[PDB]
Every structure is written in structure tokens, then in C-alpha cells.
């Protein structure tokens, strides 16, 4: 069989995507991804950092869903420390996680649509993306790599007026979702490009370690926010959409519905947001206020310690997972009692999903390969680390 | 199933009825105002928390604020700060820096800050290796905005 070597050296199809395909005419016989083109030694670097200095590495793994990975790492550190997070911080964390999910789903859906030739939804969605980037920048001072969620809570409190602007965004976002849908959902060309493409059975999804939309598309009702809840997810109403056909069209519809449910969650967080502290009060692990450090010895000492040596984490090991926008994102953290992680294994859903490309794309047309890649939602920062 | 429903399905397929709605709402946006910003005459919105180009600050007397405690050098996740010591050398490699703002959080005297400037692209790599005098010039150039932003943000940090 001939061999087509496809590497798109541009973000039209990922950017470091490299595929070796064996074809019988236009029919794909075997798809073999070649990865490591973005392998940057993140897991090795982390072992040389304090737990605070390691935190920005997690913004740069699935760099479309920054705060979700921040959240997962903070949760793992909190778990090993037995650290209690204040409720207001919990609500802010969930609110930002669902904003991130919307940011991820907009990018994924519209980049896939542009790949199969629908140009306009990308521009429409990226304007809404710009509004959400503004909330990131207002709280952290960064559009993308906020490093805002931290062990113990969040770096800073919300600026006055932010909740009102978020509410204004939520009042109009449903119409934007509706416009995207009317552009895509009922269109016969869109259905012909996605229906019965990349079918996945529930057994296959379990066998290949699929998670998130890749698993729920096959009819398996599984969402970590409900199965293993964290922060304030158990106080919130939302539905878990599941597919019936296990194909690309079902996964597209699931992502649209997930955006709607994320909007629902954001509205609830806005209304239930309580007052109080945004940082854990244990004075051995959290920075004091600027005025306290300039006024109190104990505070100054703690500030000096925290920003030079960092906190220690008692010797232990655990696996912690969250429902990231792309699926189950997990961290296997090993602590040896010191101020640096002894080992940090990052479990990226894209790694499992891209491994599944061979069986998903079997006996499909050449033009369906990009469709299947788009439905997997691959970002190579997390695949390669 | 029924002649009416089969006929309606046939007509919808033949007349491309669902393709019309996409055409219509694409045309609706055609007449609406555009969201494009007329850069560089117009700019995007930013906040007092924005993490841009670092700068070194002085007291109003002219004395430097930095007292060479080396906390920023210790915390820097990218190891982009190099200090010898008041400092006799204070270097930030702008090409190593990740613009995280940790150094500004660590500093006990508000000496190093990330200011609001984001337009400092250069033609050479060596111009992005900032030394102490360049950082102090940045501080002198942006002092009024930096001080205003600090007044605004002191109620959160």
C-alpha cells in the first residue's frame, strides 16, 4: 500500500501533527501518529521546582484549558497537604473551570468546522472567546496563563464589577450557541461529514482509556464532576449529555450541550457566590497580605520562607483526576517530604485519544482523518508534555 | 409512512430548504457593525493587573527601592533573574521569562513590577537581555501609571 506522510506544519491541523497513513486508494488502512514534536521535558523540569514554581507548567499542557490543569494540580497538592479551601474560593474555582470549558469547546468545535470548510463559525466563536479571555486578564493580569488557581484557593480576589460583567455575558451567550448550531447542526453537508464517522463502541472506549466526550459519546454515562465530585460541584444542577451512536456527530452535539450546561453552572455560581476569604487560613502554606508582611514579623518570616524555600509536603503518593474539557486529566504526585515534587506523572486524555486514531480511522476516507482528529480534540502540549 | 410526509421530505431535499437559513443569518451579520479595533489608533481593554514589561522602581527621593534581598531571583520559575550585590547587577532575560508575575509578588518593597507596557518587540535578541539601568529607565518612563495601578490594586493584595 502506498504511504502518505502528512505533517501540517501550521495550526490548521494542530501544528506538530505528524501522521503516517497506509492507503488502499482513498481508503485509510492504518493511521500511525508520530509524536514527541512538542516533548519539552515538563515532568523532568517539575522535579527541579518547588511546588509553587511548578504550577505554571500546568497552564502550558492543554494550553486551551489553562485553569482546569491549574485546578487539578492544586487539588493534588491540597490532597497531600490535607489543606481546607474556603467556600468562596471553591465557587470561584468552579466558575473559572466552566468558563474554561466554554473557551475549550468553542475553540475545538470551530477549528474542526474550519477544517471541514465552514469558515464563519470560527470568527463568531473567537469573539466570545475574547470576552472570556478578558475575565481571565481582569482576575490574573494574563489573557491565558493566569496561574490564578493555587494550592489553598486562588491568587487574588475578584475585582469589583467582574460578576456583573460575567452576568452580562451569560445573558447573551445562548443566542451565540444557537447561531453556531443553526450554522452547523441541521446542514446536510455538515451531517454528511460527521454522521457515522469514527464510530466508537462503549467497549472500545473503555479498552482504549477514553474519557470525557470521547467516552460519553458511546452511551457511557460517566462524568467525574458527578462520579468523584470536587469543590462545590455537588451543590450545582447540571445534566450529563450522552450519545446513542458513538460517532462524530454525537460528539459534536454533546459538546454543544456541554457548553449549554456550563452556562447553567456559571449562572448558579454567580448567584450562590458567598463572601469571605479566598485563601486557606493556615499560616504555614499561604502568602500573607502585603500590609501584614510590612507590619508583622511572623508574616514577614512566612513570606520570606514561602517565596524562597516553598512549603513542604509530607511523604506520600496519590493520583488525582478532574473532568477537564478534553476528558480525565490526572496527576500522579509523589512527595518525599521535601519542598520539591519527587515525581509528577501527568495523565493527559489526548494521549489516550490520539492512540485511538488507528482503530477509529480504519476503512475511512482520507478526508475523514481530519474530522476524526477534530472530534478527538488533540492539543499536543498535553500529549507530549 | 405517508404520502404527505414523504412528499415533504422529497421537496425539502430537492429545494435545499435548510441551506436557506444559513444563507439568511450569514446575510444578517453582513449589515451589522463590526467588532474590529482600529489598531494602533484604538486599543484593546486591559486591567491594572496586566502583567507586561518588568520595571525597577525608585522612592520619590530618587533612591532605588530594591535592597538586593534576592527573593525574586529565588522564586523565579524560569531562572530569568541574575543579581549581584544595593544591587550592582540586576539582569532579567526577557527571553527566559514566562511573565508570571511571581517576582512582583515576592518583592517585599514593591521594587520590581510588571508594568502595563506590552509593545516592546525588538530586532535583536541582545536588546531583550535587560540590565539594571534599562529596568530603571523603564521604571522612570512608566512610574505614573505603575503608581496608579498599585493604588488601585492595594485593596486586593
Amino acid at each position: 500500500n502506498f504511504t502518505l506522510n502528512f505533517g501540517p506544519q501550521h495550526p490548521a491541523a494542530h501544528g506538530v501533527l505528524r501522521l503516517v497513513l497506509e492507503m488502499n486508494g482513498e481508503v485509510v488502512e492504518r493511521a500511525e501518529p508520530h509524536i514527541g514534536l512538542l516533548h519539552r521535558g515538563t515532568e523532568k523540569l517539575i522535579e527541579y521546582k518547588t511546588y509553587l514554581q511548578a504550577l505554571p507548567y500546568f497552564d502550558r499542557l492543554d494550553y486551551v484549558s489553562m485553569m482546569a490543569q491549574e485546578h487539578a494540580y492544586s487539588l493534588a497538592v491540597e490532597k497531600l497537604l490535607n489543606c481546607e479551601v474556603p467556600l468562596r474560593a471553591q465557587y470561584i474555582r468552579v466558575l473559572f473551570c466552566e468558563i474554561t470549558r466554554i473557551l475549550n469547546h468553542l475553540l475545538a468545535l470551530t477549528t474542526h468546522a474550519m477544517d471541514v470548510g465552514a469558515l464563519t463559525p470560527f470568527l463568531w466563536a473567537f469573539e466570545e472567546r475574547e470576552k472570556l479571555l478578558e475575565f481571565y486578564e481582569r482576575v490574573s493580569g494574563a489573557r491565558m496563563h493566569a496561574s490564578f488557581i493555587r494550592p489553598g484557593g486562588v491568587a487574588q480576589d475578584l475585582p469589583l464589577g467582574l460578576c456583573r460583567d460575567i452576568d452580562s455575558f451569560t445573558q447573551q451567550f445562548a443566542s451565540r450557541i444557537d447561531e453556531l448550531e443553526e450554522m452547523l447542526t441541521g446542514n446536510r453537508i455538515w451531517k454528511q461529514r460527521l454522521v457515522d464517522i469514527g464510530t466508537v463502541t462503549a467497549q472500545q472506549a473503555k479498552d482504549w482509556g477514553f474519557s470525557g466526550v470521547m467516552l460519553r459519546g458511546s452511551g457511557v454515562c460517566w462524568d467525574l464532576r458527578r462520579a468523584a465530585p470536587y469543590d462545590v460541584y455537588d451543590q450545582l444542577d447540571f445534566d450529563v449529555p450522552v450519545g446513542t451512536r458513538g460517532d462524530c456527530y454525537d460528539r459534536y452535539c454533546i459538546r454543544i450541550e456541554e457548553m449549554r450546561q456550563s452556562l447553567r453552572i456559571i449562572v448558579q455560581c454567580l448567584n450562590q457566590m458567598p463572601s469571605g476569604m479566598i485563601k486557606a487560613d493556615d499560616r504555614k502554606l499561604c502568602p500573607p497580605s502585603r500590609c501584614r508582611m510590612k507590619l508583622s514579623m511572623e508574616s514577614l518570616i512566612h513570606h520570606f520562607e514561602l517565596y524562597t524555600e516553598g512549603f513542604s509536603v509530607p511523604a506520600s503518593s496519590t493520583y488525582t483526576a478532574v473532568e477537564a474539557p478534553k476528558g480525565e486529566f490526572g496527576v500522579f504526585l509523589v512527595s518525599n517530604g521535601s519542598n520539591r515534587p519527587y515525581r509528577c506523572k501527568i495523565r493527559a486524555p489526548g494521549f489516550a485519544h490520539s492512540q485511538g486514531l488507528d482503530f477509529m480511522s480504519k476503512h475511512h476516507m482520507l478526508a475523514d482523518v481530519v474530522t476524526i482528529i477534530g472530534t478527538q480534540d488533540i492539543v499536543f502540549g498535553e500529549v507530549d508534555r | 409512512k405517508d404520502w404527505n410526509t414523504v412528499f415533504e421530505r422529497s421537496i425539502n431535499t430537492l429545494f435545499l430548504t435548510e441551506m436557506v437559513r444559513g444563507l439568511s443569518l450569514t446575510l444578517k451579520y453582513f449589515f451589522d457593525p463590526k467588532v474590529t479595533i482600529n489598531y494602533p489608533f484604538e486599543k484593546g481593554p486591559l486591567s491594572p493587573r496586566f502583567r507586561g514589561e518588568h520595571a525597577l522602581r525608585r522612592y520619590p527621593t530618587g533612591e532605588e527601592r530594591c535592597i538586593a534581598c534576592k527573593l525574586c531571583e529565588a522564586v523565579c520559575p524560569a531562572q530569568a533573574i541574575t543579581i549581584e550585590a544595593r544591587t550592582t547587577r540586576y539582569d532579567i532575560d526577557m527571553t527566559k521569562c514566562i511573565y508570571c508575575g511571581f517576582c512582583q509578588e515576592a518583592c517585599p518593597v514593591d521594587a520590581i513590577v510588571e508594568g502595563p507596557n506590552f509593545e516592546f518587540a525588538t530586532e535583536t535578541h541582545e536588546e531583550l537581555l535587560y540590565d539594571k539601568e534599562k529596568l530603571l529607565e523603564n521604571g522612570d518612563r512608566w512610574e505614573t501609571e505603575i503608581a496608579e495601578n498599585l493604588r488601585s490594586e492595594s485593596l486586593y493584595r
Binding site: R88, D157, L158, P159, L160, G161, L162, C163, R164, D167, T170, Q171, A174, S175, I177, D178, E181, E182, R260, Q261, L263, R264, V267, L270, N271, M273, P274, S275, G276 | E8, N12, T17, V20, R21, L155
Partner: peptide, 27 residues
């Protein structure tokens, strides 16, 4: 200080999240 960013008294106005129908077309 004692003032934090949050909802107004009574909360924010309800927002729709579900799809809206559209019966447009002579058919």
C-alpha cells in the same frame, strides 16, 4: 476591605441556556 464582588440583592436576572425554536419558512 469588607466589600467583595458578588451578586446584587435578589441575584441576577434569569438567563436562558436551552435552544430556542424558529418556525421560519413557507414550506
Amino acid at each position: 476591605p469588607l466589600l467583595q464582588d458578588g451578586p446584587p440583592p435578589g441575584g441576577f436576572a434569569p438567563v436562558r441556556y436551552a435552544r430556542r425554536i424558529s418556525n421560519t419558512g413557507p414550506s
